[PDB]
Nucleic acid binder design. Structure first.
Lengths: 166, 374, 32, 176, 458
RNA sequence: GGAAACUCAAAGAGUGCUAUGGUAUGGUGACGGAGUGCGCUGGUCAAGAGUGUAAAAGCUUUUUGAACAGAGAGCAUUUCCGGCAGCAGAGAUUUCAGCUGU
């Protein structure tokens, strides 16, 4: 059970709800490995329930650094607290699929009722939504995702290197 | 195909609608071929929200014709059979399908909400809650949906706890637009006004103050200032101290203009202690804002707040008994301002004179007022 | 069971009735 | 329960019911501890002066010529009362009114069709007792071309319907 | 649940001339519930049927229906149908055998002399015009407009879409009648030899050669219901044939003299045969009763055809005459030619036409439209016959608006579900059953002189 | 061999498009809405029990109780409504909202 999916991206955060589980035991097979390439069958697995866009490139760079060093930011806290059901912390946590095994501990530090999965099943679910991108989102974001990617990559790199224009 | 499924889901209501002798077979075949056109346009490729909207309009028109024909043929207003709810259920499902396919046009989402609310007793408020929940999930940043959700659940249901939860969750999501802040202080003032008016009413038949609105006023100033200093000067802080002080001054101008709008639409709540609830915003603006609003620039704003603090008891009608009581307070205010200011002294004197002359036998007591403020 | 004018108007909408359309095409006679 | 599971036409193998938690709503708080600075400020003010509205339930849980003359204070109290107050008022009016009221032309050959006695079965198969029963099983085609779409789906859905990627647990009954 | 039109959608079953098993009892109860639900829900589709059938109705007692002229129809109906009512005047080659594709999109004409043209008669697109200078007799499409088979001087040839010759069949020695069986992919061939040949078009393999043993085959028709072939001989005998049995399944004594033409209803219930003894005869097919015997036609009926809505088009040379509701059991549905004194219980012609110059070669209704294409000595003429076509086709059996991709995929799919030639029986519902031997109860292996009286003991 | 094209066909490859029913709408007055009761979720506190110990503390607990916070995700049944007016109120001449009796 891989119930929800968290995809971080330069325009904002997306929470998807996993409709159908993919196969666990047959996860290396040919048909299971190329159903994430076919879009007509990937939309049988993944459904978008929420997308919180960023306030601009400033909050984009803040959340890019927080996602980079593995911390839950305030917009993450907001969207996860909106979307994930108040499960128990001792019996059957709600299962969130992330792509970052050291972002998981920061998610359970804030929501103890959430167990986080990033193994190969969550990895290829995540790369399915990365492979399709703008088609899953049904038209609900401002800004082209690759244009925001160019801006965020340049901003992240100049921040990380302390590029001064003086 | 799924148009076949939906079209043959449409058949029991017209079974019933032919048995109840209002429609005939040759006209129900015409409404089925129009509905076939619409269902095929819906679940084929290249679909449009205008196809959804025209289907909803056609189904509402055949519902109105069905009601008219029922009143004319059977002379009842509902046959209490399948064929009086099936078509509204169909319209609701066309709306649900359309909002699942194109969840991006708030015109269609709001038409869904309007039809679902106006359906009346037959709908369920938890059914409206479900589509509010998924719409707020998809558009958390769009703020008018938060206002509309809380407005539906206070101005129709009067659910103060859930309304407070909606406003706090919206302010968690986008704590950057001042419109949600203003509608939250508006909701809290409306709630405390209804509280003290039900107290007054239970007194007239037979502690908890605006300090909530002041605390959300305080966090409104703090977080709006934080988000403007983070929004402008966007990527980095690569700016010398001239540009940093220019930025901080401009955020003070921004935030203080919003508090000017706050007091301007704060005055009309005059059923609570309006003097205390405006004077606390006065004392919250009077303190230091880390870049010398009084002792340096924004001295025009300092003069504006001084004029507000002077007229804060003189917010009165032409019956000027309060002026005859405490115009010496305004005179001492003008003296204390002109004891320090240089051109703001003459500005505040001429402005208080022009304001009192514009706002204030009856001209003979006004001749006393003109001799006072001359 | 009489007729009705509003009922026949929206019935002409619902059943897709071009009867008044052909009446107007036969009637308009290029009068201008 | 073993008998009704043997007799059930369709088993949907999430059969032990999953413990549904309370949904992540936007009308409430999904953590029940103050999560923002606004929330903790509003709750410390509201616990200086609490608003659980038991006082605001007992205040509006108080209010012939009461029916005819009081047509203004009735509308005032209607505008004044809160959610649970109006629910209790509707219940009180409902209980009060319910306490108030109550040479030959055809020659057929009858040779055996040795080429298509392979398209008909040799005997009657096991679960039936005669060919009338067995051909009453075969008498209706389940095809898309011969049924409607709903009937086609009802005829072709299988008995055992599992979910494709989650564990099937053993059955648990309400106290055996 | 009641559904006034269920008995069209009902399905017959076996009867003996209840059970103690609990599990089998409830299984049969579920099966009967599912059959009733399926019949009811399948019969509720008549609301969803888009179009309505055509007609023409007299609205007066002076206005008879057989005296309504084709120009009057073409004035009274729309421009699309008036343009479908084509007329090709092809004078120099012989009388034109007409043939339509099974959706009405393509027309295949054959001159007697040599002129075979396959065309899209409703656009203006011909896609094969080939002049095979030996006397051609008949042609048919195979599964498409993409292949057609022509019966030439002796050998049957098979041509592709643009008219290149694909096959010369060395069997099928003298065909005069070709017909394709579309669910079985079989080209059926009969003619001057007394032989009936079934040829599989997909594999390429001659499936059956059957001795008619009754001389040349005078007429030939296909039951669309169960794909058995009704051949009419010079005995006055129709015989019903299948490619499994080397003997005819049934032999009926239809007429005296020879049998000029046979037509079968698409429901597989009625068969109209015209003999050369001036006798039209309507036959029950399922129970093999003779329904009607219209004897003493004024001249022998050279053709009959039955539309999809059950009209009966007889042609007697220059004349074409159509009767409505003639294929019914009652004696008031016997097709007359006049109503003697205005009897309402006499089936006068539904409409008639006179091809005054010539003698018509054959008749064929256009499949899903209200037209009758008659091919005659100077070419083709479509007649607007308003009651004469299924208004509501099924678009996944055969589609008149089908595209190139739909043709390709439907060709592969019908090729994949091609029925074997052995499944052709007199009734189609006899390939799920058990043998008519092999006892109807299944067996449970448990079931698997007073002196002479003294002299007895000796 | 060559040329032309808003020409007619026969096929191949790639790309695009939410391309989305894992068992199809909230409802054949057999119905819906309201309310109640049962059921469910979460945290807190208390009790039990185990384990540990000089006593503990701690830790475990598919053990119960309490008030609180809720979810829309289940199940009843006659508690009312989907009957009529009189009347005021609500929004843009249609729909919406409660009192006195049938």
């Amino acid at each position: 059970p891989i119930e929800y999916l968290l995809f971080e991206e330069p325009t904002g955060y997306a929470v998807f709800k996993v409709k159908l589980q993919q196969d666990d035991i047959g996860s290396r097979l040919k048909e299971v490995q190329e159903q994430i390439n076919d879009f007509g069958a990937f939309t049988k697995l993944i459904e978008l329930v929420s997308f919180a866009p960023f306030k601009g490139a400033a909050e984009a760079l803040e959340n890019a650094n927080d996602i980079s060093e593995g911390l839950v930011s305030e917009s993450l806290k907001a969207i996860l607290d909106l979307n994930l059901p108040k499960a128990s912390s001792k019996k059957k946590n709600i299962t969130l699929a992330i792509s970052d095994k050291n972002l998981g501990p920061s998610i359970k530090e804030e929501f103890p009722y959430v167990d986080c999965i990033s193994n190969e099943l969550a990895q290829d679910l995540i790369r399915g939504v990365r492979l399709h991108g703008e088609k899953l989102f049904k038209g609900l974001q401002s800004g082209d995702l690759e244009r925001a990617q160019l801006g965020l990559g340049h901003a992240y790199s100049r921040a990380k290197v302390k590029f001064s224009v003086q | 195909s799924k148009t076949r499924y939906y079209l043959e889901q449409c058949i029991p209501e017209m079974d019933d609608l032919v048995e109840k002798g209002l429609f005939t077979k040759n006209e129900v075949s015409l409404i089925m071929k129009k509905r076939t056109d619409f269902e095929h346009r819906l679940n084929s490729r290249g679909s449009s929200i205008n196809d959804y909207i025209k289907y909803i309009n056609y189904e509402s028109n055949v519902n109105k014709l069905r009601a008219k024909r029922c009143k004319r043929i059977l002379q009842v207003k509902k046959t209490n059979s399948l064929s009086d709810w099936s078509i509204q259920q169909r319209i609701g499902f066309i709306y649900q399908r359309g909002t699942n396919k194109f969840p991006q046009d708030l015109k269609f989402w709001a038409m869904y909400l309007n039809y679902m609310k106006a359906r009346g007793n037959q709908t369920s408020y938890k059914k409206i809650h479900n589509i509010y929940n998924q719409l707020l999930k998809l558009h958390p940043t769009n703020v008018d949906i938060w206002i509309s959700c809380a407005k539906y659940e206070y101005e129709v249901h009067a659910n103060f706890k859930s309304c407070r939860n909606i406003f706090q969750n919206g302010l968690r999501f986008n704590p950057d637009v001042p419109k949600l802040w203003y509608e939250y202080v508006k909701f809290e003032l409306n709630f405390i006004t209804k509280l003290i008016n039900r107290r007054k009413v239970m007194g007239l038949i037979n502690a908890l103050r605006g300090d909530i609105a002041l605390t959300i006023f305080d966090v409104c100033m703090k977080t709006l200032g934080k988000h403007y200093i983070n929004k402008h000067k966007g990527y980095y802080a690569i700016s010398d101290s001239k540009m940093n002080i220019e930025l901080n001054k401009e955020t003070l101008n921004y935030l203080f203009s919003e508090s000017l709008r706050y007091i301007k639409l704060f005055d009309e709540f005059l059923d609570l202690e309006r003097d205390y609830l405006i004077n606390h915003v006065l004392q919250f603006w009077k303190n230091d804002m880390y870049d010398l609003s009084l002792r340096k620039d924004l001295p025009e704003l300092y003069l504006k707040t001084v004029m507000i603090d002077i007229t804060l008891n003189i917010r009165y009608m032409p019956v000027e008994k309060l002026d005859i009581d405490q115009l010496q307070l305004s005179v001492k205010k003008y003296f204390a301002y002109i004891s320090k200011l240089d051109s703001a002294s003459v500005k505040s004197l001429k402005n208080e004179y022009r304001s009192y002359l514009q706002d204030n036998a009856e001209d003979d007591p006004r001749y006393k007022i003109l001799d006072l403020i001359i | 069971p009489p007729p009705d004018e509003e009922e026949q108007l929206l019935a002409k909408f619902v059943f897709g009735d071009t009867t008044d359309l052909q009446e107007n095409l036969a009637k308009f006679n290029a009068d201008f | 329960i073993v008998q009704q599971n043997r007799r059930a036409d369709h088993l949907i193998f999430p059969l032990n019911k999953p413990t549904e938690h309370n949904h992540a709503s936007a009308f409430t708080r999904t953590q029940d501890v103050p999560q923002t600075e606004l929330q903790e400020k509003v709750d410390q003010v509201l616990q200086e002066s609490n608003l659980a509205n038991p006082e605001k339930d007992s205040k509006f849980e108080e209010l012939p010529e009461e029916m005819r003359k009081r047509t203004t204070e009735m509308r005032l109290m209607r505008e004044l009362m809160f959610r649970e107050e109006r629910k209790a008022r509707r219940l009180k009016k409902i209980k009060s009114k319910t306490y108030r009221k109550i040479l030959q032309n055809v020659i057929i050959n009858e040779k055996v069709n040795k080429k298509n006695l392979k398209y008909q079965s040799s005997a009657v198969p096991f679960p039936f007792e005669n060919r009338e029963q067995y051909e009453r099983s075969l008498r209706m085609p389940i095809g898309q071309e011969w049924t409607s779409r709903a009937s086609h789906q009802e005829l072709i859905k299988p008995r055992i319907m599992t979910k494709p990627g989650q564990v099937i647990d053993p059955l648990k009954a309400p106290f055996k | 649940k009641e559904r006034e039109n269920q008995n069209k959608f009902e399905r017959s079953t076996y009867t003996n001339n209840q059970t103690k098993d609990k599990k089998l009892r409830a299984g049969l109860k579920k099966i009967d519930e599912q059959y009733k639900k399926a019949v009811s829900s399948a019969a509720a589709t008549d609301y969803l049927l888009p179009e309505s059938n055509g007609y023409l109705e007299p609205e007066n007692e002076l206005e008879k229906t057989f005296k309504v002229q084709q120009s009057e129809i073409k004035s009274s109906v729309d421009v699309s149908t008036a343009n479908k009512a084509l007329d090709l005047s092809l004078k120099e080659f012989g009388p034109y055998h007409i043939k339509y594709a099974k959706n009405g999109t393509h027309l295949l004409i054959t001159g007697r002399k040599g002129h075979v043209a396959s065309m899209d008669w409703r656009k203006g697109q011909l896609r094969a015009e080939l002049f095979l200078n030996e006397t051609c007799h008949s042609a048919t499409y195979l599964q498409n407009e993409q292949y057609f088979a022509v019966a030439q001087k002796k050998y049957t040839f098979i041509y592709d879409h643009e008219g290149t010759e694909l096959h010369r069949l060395k069997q099928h020695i003298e065909a005069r009648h070709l017909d394709f069986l579309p669910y079985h992919y079989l080209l059926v061939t009969a003619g001057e030899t007394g032989w009936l040949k079934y040829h599989d078009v997909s594999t390429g393999q001659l499936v059956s050669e059957l001795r008619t043993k009754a001389g040349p085959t005078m007429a030939m028709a296909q039951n669309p219901w169960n794909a058995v072939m009704h051949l009419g001989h010079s005995n006055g005998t129709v015989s019903l044939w299948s490619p499994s049995m080397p003997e005819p399944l049934v032999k009926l004594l239809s007429a005296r003299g020879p049998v000029n033409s046979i037509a079968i209803d698409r429901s597989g219930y009625y068969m109209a045969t015209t003999g050369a003894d001036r006798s039209m005869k309507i036959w029950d097919i399922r129970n093999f009763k003779q329904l009607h015997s219209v004897e003493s036609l004024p001249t022998p009926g050279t053709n009959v055809s039955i539309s999809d809505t059950g009209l009966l088009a007889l042609s007697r040379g220059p004349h074409v005459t159509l009767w409505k509701d003639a294929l019914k059991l009652s004696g008031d549905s016997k097709p007359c030619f006049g109503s003697m004194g205005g009897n309402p219980h006499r089936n006068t012609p539904y409409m008639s036409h006179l091809f005054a110059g010539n003698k018509v070669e054959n008749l064929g209704f256009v499949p899903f439209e209200d037209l009758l294409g008659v091919g005659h000595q100077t070419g083709i003429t479509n007649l607007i016959v308003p009651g004469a076509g299924e208004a509501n086709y099924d678009a996944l059996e055969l589609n008149p608006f089908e595209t190139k991709k739909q043709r390709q995929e439907q060709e592969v799919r019908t090729l994949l579900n091609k029925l074997p030639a052995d499944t052709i029986t007199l009734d189609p519902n006899s390939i799920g059953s058990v043998d008519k031997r092999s006892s109807t109860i299944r067996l449970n292996a448990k079931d698997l002189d007073v002196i002479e009286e003294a002299l007895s003991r000796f």
